[PDB]
């Protein structure tokens, strides 16, 4: 894990019936916990859902851990890790996503699957009424030998309202790794730019680990 790394990504998924494939390329600085990506819709253009639901599936190797917190992500390399996630929205939309993260040379590779079901037809995902994810703090804890992370997320709506989502993530190291204690990872996630139908997006993430 150098201090400059490059990121590659393919995501395939179905949201509410609609198939899509999206690829990204980008760059990040693992130790500063920042990363940026450029994303291109390859299939299923144009998307009939809020692009914002996908963004958080687009690598916690990219988080700044102090020296008193064992970094579960960085230690899993070179061999790697995978995570799985459920995203449960307050109106009944439910998303499943995973990622298989591999390292090869100076690049991180990401193999993503994302599936959304039961979004109400006139709710904020289907009527594209989302503006952003508010920052958040993910809680990280060990269970059955493996790392899990929990966050209450909220999307800011067009209108000033919020739409809540509970994330549950299990991260699995492909080898043994010094387990950490209960800690937090702050997140800030931002569409830096996009073209009209979100066929092209530039995404940024700032994440920092801490203890409270």
For residues 123 and 64, give the distance between their C-alpha atoms in angstroms, rounded to a whole number: 36
Interface with a second copy, residue 120, by CB under 8 A: yes
Interface residue with a second copy among 32, 100, 134, 186 (CB under 8 A) is: 100
For residues 124 and 165, give the distance between their C-alpha atoms in angstroms, rounded to a whole number: 12
**Burial of 29 (C-beta count, 10 Å sphere; 0-12/13-18/19+):** middle
Interface with a second copy, residue 116, by CB under 8 A: yes
Q: For the CB of residue 207, give the shortest distance to a second copy in the complex, in Å.
A: 21
Q: For the CB of residue 100, give the shortest distance to a second copy in the complex, in Å.
A: 8
Interface residue with a second copy among 1, 8, 10, 14 (CB under 8 A) is: 14
Q: For the CB of residue 170, give the shortest distance to a second copy in the complex, in Å.
A: 5
C-beta closer to a second copy: residue 58 or 65: 58
Q: For the CB of residue 92, give the shortest distance to a second copy in the complex, in Å.
A: 6
Interface with a second copy, residue 78, by CB under 8 A: no
Pairing label, strands 94-104, 107-117: antiparallel
For residues 203 and 194, give the distance between their C-alpha atoms in angstroms, rounded to a whole number: 9
Pick out residues in 146-165 that bind a second copy (CB under 8 A): 146
For residues 28 and 4, give the distance between their C-alpha atoms in angstroms, rounded to a whole number: 6
Pick out residues in 80-99 that bind a second copy (CB under 8 A): 82, 84-86, 88, 92, 94-98
Q: For the CB of residue 125, give the shortest distance to a second copy in the complex, in Å.
A: 13
Interface with a second copy, residue 127, by CB under 8 A: no
For residues 1 and 105, give the distance between their C-alpha atoms in angstroms, rounded to a whole number: 9
Compute the chain's Rg from CA coordinates.
Answer: 16
Interface with a second copy, residue 122, by CB under 8 A: yes
**Burial of 91 (C-beta count, 10 Å sphere; 0-12/13-18/19+):** middle
Pairing label, strands 200-210, 183-194: antiparallel
For residues 129 and 132, give the distance between their C-alpha atoms in angstroms, rounded to a whole number: 10
Interaction site with a second copy (CB under 8 A): 14, 16-17, 82, 84-86, 88, 92, 94-98, 100, 113, 115-118, 120-122, 143-146, 168, 170
């Amino acid at each position: 894990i150098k201090s400059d790394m490059k990121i590659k990504l393919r995501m395939e998924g179905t949201v509410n019936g609609h198939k899509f494939v999206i690829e990204g390329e980008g760059e990040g600085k693992p130790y500063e916990g920042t990363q940026t990506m450029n994303l291109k819709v390859k299939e299923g253009a144009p998307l009939p859902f809020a692009y914002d639901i996908l963004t958080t599936a687009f690598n916690r190797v990219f988080a700044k851990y102090p020296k008193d917190i064992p970094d579960y992500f960085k230690q899993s390399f070179p061999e790697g890790y995978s995570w799985e996630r459920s995203m449960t929205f307050e109106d009944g939309g439910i998303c499943t996503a995973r990622n298989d993260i591999t390292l090869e040379g100076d690049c991180f590779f990401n193999e993503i699957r994302f599936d959304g079901v039961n979004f109400p037809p006139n709710g904020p995902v289907m009527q594209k009424k989302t503006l952003k994810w508010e920052p958040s703090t993910e809680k990280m804890y060990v269970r059955d030998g493996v790392l899990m992370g929990d966050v209450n997320m909220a999307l800011l709506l067009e209108g000033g309202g919020h739409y809540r989502c509970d994330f549950k993530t299990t991260y699995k190291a492909k080898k043994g790794v010094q387990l950490p204690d209960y800690h937090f990872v702050d997140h800030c996630i931002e569409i830096l730019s996009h073209d009209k139908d979100y066929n092209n997006v530039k995404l940024y993430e700032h994440a920092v680990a801490h203890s409270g």
